[PDB]
Amino acid sequence: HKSEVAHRFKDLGEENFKALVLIAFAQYLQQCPFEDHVKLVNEVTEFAKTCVADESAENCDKSLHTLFGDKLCTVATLRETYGEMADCCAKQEPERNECFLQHKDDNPNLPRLVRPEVDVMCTAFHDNEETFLKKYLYEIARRHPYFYAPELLFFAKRYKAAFTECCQAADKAACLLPKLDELRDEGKASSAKQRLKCASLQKFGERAFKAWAVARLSQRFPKAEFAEVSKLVTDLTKVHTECCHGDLLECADDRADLAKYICENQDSISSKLKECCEKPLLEKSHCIAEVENDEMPADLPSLAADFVESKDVCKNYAEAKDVFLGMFLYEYARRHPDYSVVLLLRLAKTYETTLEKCCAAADPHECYAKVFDEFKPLVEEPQNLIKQNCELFEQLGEYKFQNALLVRYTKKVPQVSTPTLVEVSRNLGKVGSKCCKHPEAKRMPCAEDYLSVVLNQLCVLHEKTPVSDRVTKCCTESLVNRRPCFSALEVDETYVPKEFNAETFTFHADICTLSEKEEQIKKQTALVELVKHKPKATKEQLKAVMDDFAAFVEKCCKADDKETCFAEEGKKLVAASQAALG
Numbered sequence: 001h002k003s004e005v006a007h008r009f010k011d012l013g014e015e016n017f018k019a020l021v022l023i024a025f026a027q028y029l030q031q032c033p034f035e036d037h038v039k040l041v042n043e044v045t046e047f048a049k050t051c052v053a054d055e056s057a058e059n060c061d062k063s064l065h066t067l068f069g070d071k072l073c074t075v076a077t078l079r080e081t082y083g084e085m086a087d088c089c090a091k092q093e094p095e096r097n098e099c100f101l102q103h104k105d106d107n108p109n110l111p112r113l114v115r116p117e118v119d120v121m122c123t124a125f126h127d128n129e130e131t132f133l134k135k136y137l138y139e140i141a142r143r144h145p146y147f148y149a150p151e152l153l154f155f156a157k158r159y160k161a162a163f164t165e166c167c168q169a170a171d172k173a174a175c176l177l178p179k180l181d182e183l184r185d186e187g188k189a190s191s192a193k194q195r196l197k198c199a200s201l202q203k204f205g206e207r208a209f210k211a212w213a214v215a216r217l218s219q220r221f222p223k224a225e226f227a228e229v230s231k232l233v234t235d236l237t238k239v240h241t242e243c244c245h246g247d248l249l250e251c252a253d254d255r256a257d258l259a260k261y262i263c264e265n266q267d268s269i270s271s272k273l274k275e276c277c278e279k280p281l282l283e284k285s286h287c288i289a290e291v292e293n294d295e296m297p298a299d300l301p302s303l304a305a306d307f308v309e310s311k312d313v314c315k316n317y318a319e320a321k322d323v324f325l326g327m328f329l330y331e332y333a334r335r336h337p338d339y340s341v342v343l344l345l346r347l348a349k350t351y352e353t354t355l356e357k358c359c360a361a362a363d364p365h366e367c368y369a370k371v372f373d374e375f376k377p378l379v380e381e382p383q384n385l386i387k388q389n390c391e392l393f394e395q396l397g398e399y400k401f402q403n404a405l406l407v408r409y410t411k412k413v414p415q416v417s418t419p420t421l422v423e424v425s426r427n428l429g430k431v432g433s434k435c436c437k438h439p440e441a442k443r444m445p446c447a448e449d450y451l452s453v454v455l456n457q458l459c460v461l462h463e464k465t466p467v468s469d470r471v472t473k474c475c476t477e478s479l480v481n482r483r484p485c486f487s488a489l490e491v492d493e494t495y496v497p498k499e500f501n502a503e504t505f506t507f508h509a510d511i512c513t514l515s516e517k518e519e520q521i522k523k524q525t526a527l528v529e530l531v532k533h534k535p536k537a538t539k540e541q542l543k544a545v546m547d548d549f550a551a552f553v554e555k556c557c558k559a560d561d562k563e564t565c566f567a568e569e570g571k572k573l574v575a576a577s578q579a580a581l582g
């Protein structure tokens with residue numbers, strides 16, 4: 001109460017406090033060495049303990065923003081290292097804090113972080129767990145200044161858990177490696193979603209966010225009253241608006257409040273918030289944001305009652321348009337947890353466009369009478385794609401499914417670079433393996449979650465190295481139109497084939513020692529180049545070539561003087577293949 005530092009220290013706990021303070025400093029002073037930050041953390045922690053012992057001790061009354069800023073301005077090489085940022089220190093709070101936010105660089109120039117060999121890690125881990133973990137916490141945090149700290153803390157613990165379980169295993173690598181790769185992706189996805197959610201808010205505006213949230217919060221809490229959901233969407237919008245601005249403290253308090261509000265009213269929101277609400281102040285938010293959907297009420301009316309058959313439709317709509325559309329969304333979303341949020345938005349958009357026409361016409365009811373028929377094809381498009389694509393993935397495996405997508409998209413946008421096409425298709429493939437395992441009722445929400453990040457990543461690259469107007473149309477298109485726009489792309493009739501290049505199709509024995517992962521990316525790269533050269537090739541033609549290449553390899557890696565083989569049969573394969581594809 002009287003001392004903020006003392007208060008947070010007591011809430012968080014020493015360990016958590018020390019880690020958060022470290023992350024906080026690493027995100028601002030992204031250039032200072034690790035031992036320098038460690039020094040700061042200790043100084044702040046010691047200060048904190050003083051305040052815990054006596055809330056009236058010097059400076060214990062200062063605000064976290066103030067203490068933090070002062071400490072920051074302490075750094076002697078502040079001007080020589082961060083130049084312009086040092087001028088913030090001449091300002092008074094809150095301009096000082098505001099000034100610091102502005103100079104935090106989003107994408108700093110730091111070397112890629114390379115993964116050491118399992119044995120060095122595990123020994124480092126054992127020989128000095130604290131510094132090994134904090135050292136990486138530091139390296140990761142300085143590279144993602146915008147990654148919400150507590151979230152970064154949750155990942156660290158997932159990492160600690162992996163080293164503990166695996167560094168004792170019989171086959172460390174067999175245990176750890178796959179774990180590290182899983183965490184990396186989750187970390188990447190989490191980072192992407194965060195940037196995405198804020199970028200989306202800037203572009204599309206508050207209304208669109210509120211809509212997306214109404215739909216999402218309604219699928220998850222089907223039993224809550226519309227007024228509660230509204231209350232929540234309202235507060236949730238402030239929270240995200242604030243958290244995007246970047247101030248960790250402000251963000252942290254807004255989220256905490258929201259979580260407490262939710263827990264106090266849990267029995268009037270959802271029956272699934274029990275476990276989450278018991279957890280520590282530091283984990284509540286995270287938990288709730290991931291809670292599973294509650295059971296939807298058994299006795300639920302027909303949507304057509306209040307939205308198609310009622311006589312006061314246009315009257316209720318004209319009176320408060322967005323509120324009316326929100327109720328529609330609410331009602332429609334909580335009966336369809338199986339729908340993707342964006343799909344629900346499309347229906348809402350459709351119902352809106354209809355009421356706008358119909359309520360201005362002679363006899364409204366007559367005009368908007370069959371709107372639910374409008375929805376049918378809208379709902380079906382995403383459903384057929386899932387069925388069709390999961391079936392294909394069922395037959396072929398992940399890898400072969402990835403090759404299928406490779407041929408499919410190269411033909412649609414041959415202008416894209418081969419490395420980019422490879423990454424996209426591979427990740428598209430992963431989405432297929434990760435979601436197709438789910439029961440049909442949960443597939444769509446799954447694909448949407450994963451596809452959103454992949455589509456955004458694809459758009460960002462392209463944004464930097466523009467290549468196709470079509471991709472640009474889809475990338476800058478409506479939030480709700482993005483995926484449909486890509487789905488609508490057709491083979492590029494215009495495209496002009498790339499001239500043959502012997503090199504591009506020559507292979508060496510080294511391919512035999514390449515890691516399974518790199519072997520594929522090598523074959524898949526050739527495949528893309530193959531299509532870019534012979535775009536009019538049919539599935540039959542291609543499949544045959546791919547079959548030869550397949551054999552080609554297995555054969556040359558299981559024979560003496562491998563080198564000769566590849567260069568000898570290579571002439572043959574390539575010569576025959578060119579002939580078959582005219």
Ligand SMILES: COc1ccc2c(c1)c(CC(=O)O)c(C)n2C(=O)c1ccc(Cl)cc1
Binds near residue numbers: 113114155183191
């Ligand atoms: C070359 O392939 C990658 C891919 C993703 C990567 C990194 C390197 C690095 C390392 C680097 O920046 O060089 C980081 C930090 N990545 C993340 O996005 C991330 C974020 C949060 C967590 Cl918890 C874990 C991972």
Ligand SMILES: COc1ccc2c(c1)c(CC(=O)O)c(C)n2C(=O)c1ccc(Cl)cc1
Binds near residue numbers: 205236341
């Ligand atoms: C509970 O309320 C929300 C609100 C926005 C959301 C999400 C959930 C989720 C999570 C989910 O879909 O369950 C994602 C991925 N959001 C966005 O990226 C986003 C951000 C801004 C706009 Cl304008 C539109 C969409």
Ligand SMILES: CCCCC1C(=O)N(c2ccccc2)N(c2ccccc2)C1=O
Binds near residue numbers: 288
């Ligand atoms: C743009 C992504 C939104 C994710 C998110 C979420 O689902 N909940 C959320 C969950 C249920 C009701 C309302 C919001 N809160 C959340 C906010 C503060 C504290 C705890 C959870 C979130 O930030």
Ligand SMILES: CCCCCCCCCCCCCC(=O)O
Binds near residue numbers: 114116157
């Ligand atoms: C998330 C904070 C805890 C840090 C633990 C990370 C230890 C593993 C080091 C490898 C990280 C580089 C990312 C990768 O390519 O795997």
Ligand SMILES: CCCCCCCCCCCCCC(=O)O
Binds near residue numbers: 008255
């Ligand atoms: C500078 C010392 C204070 C450390 C700053 C970090 C404070 C974070 C408070 C943790 C609250 C969890 C919020 C949430 O649920 O997301």
Ligand SMILES: CCCCCCCCCCCCCC(=O)O
Binds near residue numbers: 210327348349478
């Ligand atoms: C508080 C409830 C507000 C809900 C407003 C409903 C709007 C539905 C249209 C979907 C918005 C996507 C943006 C668009 O393309 O128009």
Ligand SMILES: CCCCCCCCCCCCCC(=O)O
Binds near residue numbers: 523577578
């Ligand atoms: C001009 C024709 C050159 C022939 C080169 C064929 C390269 C395509 C790579 C085929 C890899 C398919 C993957 C697999 O076999 O599993």
